[PDB]
Predict the structure of Spike glycoprotein.
Amino acid sequence: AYTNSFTRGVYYPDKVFRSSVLHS
Amino acid sequence: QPTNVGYQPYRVVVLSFELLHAPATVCGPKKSTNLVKNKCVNFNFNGLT
Ligand SMILES: *[C@@H]1O[C@H](CO)[C@@H](O)[C@H](O)[C@H]1NC(C)=O
């Protein structure tokens, strides 16, 4: 049994309040 | 054995220290003081200075 994952599995890499930003 | 400096036992310790995104944890002996908001403060928090 299978699916496309879609946009899932992200997790917080670090404990920093970065905000209103696109960051790599 | 003491029969052997070249071949005699020497203790070694390596201390390795961490600066993660986490709050700090293993701390020096220094003394805390009051949070003087809205003035130009020199600061240390946890070595972050
Ligand atoms: C997943 O991959 C298999 C082959 O490995 C394929 O038969 C199946 O249709 C795929 N399913 C999806 C949801 O992409």
Summary: The interface with chain B takes residues 14-16 of chain A (CB under 8 Å). The pocket of 2-acetamido-2-deoxy-beta-D-glucopyranose is lined by residues A 2-4 (CB under 6 Å). The CA atoms of residues 12 and 20 of chain A lie 16 Å apart. The two ends of chain A are 33 Å apart (CA to CA).
